[PDB]
């Protein structure tokens, strides 16, 4: 569950 900086 690796989301980019902008997400979450």
């Amino acid at each position, epitope marked *: *569950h*690796q*989301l*980019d*900086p*902008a*997400f*979450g």
Partner: antibody
């Protein structure tokens, strides 16, 4: 696999408000990823609007946060977008999308026409 | 918020050429640039993410590079099904942004 489908009014009076539904199949919106809303204007220019993380957090593009709101219904596994005091500058194509590593899955997107 | 400019507005070329599209940022965005393709009357589809990583399903003639500011989408061999609009967006900073897009036409 993942699947996104938009729906909602196709034509509205200016200044009115409304909600665009995004129903997803194949994945739980409480499981992971940010669930966004993106609109593309008549020129191919894309514009991010807002998203609702799987956890519940909400984020809005500063230039629209005055008149919009993202919400959800974990039960029916959907999320909606409300726009108020809409103007004609708002007619365009709206896409619901899942973001994680960039914008993963998109839907067919629905077109909206703001006219009197 | 960090502005993403796409240099080639409309690029005209032959099938089997070599096209390199450019995408620039206002500020550092590390490696968080994705490229999307959009055939007419069709929605964008992820092509390249993480600057280089090729998204599952993307053929080989597509390769990206670039580090926090200057990125490029290279299409080793152009095909007829590459004739479309290409967009790029960053996912590093809060308001996610896209560029104006780069349309790839056919030379005749």
């Amino acid at each position: 696999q993942v699947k996104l489908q938009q729906s909602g009014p196709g034509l509205v009076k200016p200044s009115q408000s409304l909600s665009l539904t995004c129903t997803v199949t194949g994945y739980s919106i409480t499981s992971d990823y940010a669930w966004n809303w993106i609109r593309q204007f008549p020129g191919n220019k894309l514009e991010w609007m807002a998203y609702i993380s799987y956890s519940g957090s909400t984020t809005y593009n500063p230039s629209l946060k005055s008149r919009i709101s993202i919400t959800r219904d974990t039960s029916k596994n959907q999320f909606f977008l409300q726009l108020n005091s809409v103007t004609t500058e708002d007619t365009a194509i709206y896409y619901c999308a899942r973001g994680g590593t960039g914008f993963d899955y998109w839907g067919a997107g629905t077109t909206l026409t703001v006219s009197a | 918020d960090i502005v993403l400019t796409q240099s080639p507005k409309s690029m005209s070329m032959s099938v089997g050429e070599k096209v390199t599209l450019s995408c620039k940022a206002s500020e550092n965005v590390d490696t968080y640039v994705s490229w999307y393709q959009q055939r007419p009357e069709q929605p964008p589809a992820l092509l390249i993410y993480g600057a280089s990583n090729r998204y599952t399903g993307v053929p080989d003639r597509f390769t990206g590079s670039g580090s926090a500011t200057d990125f490029t989408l290279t299409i080793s061999s152009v095909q007829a099904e590459d004739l479309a609009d290409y967009h790029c967006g960053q996912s590093y900073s809060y308001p996610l942004t896209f560029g104006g897009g780069t349309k790839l036409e056919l030379k005749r």
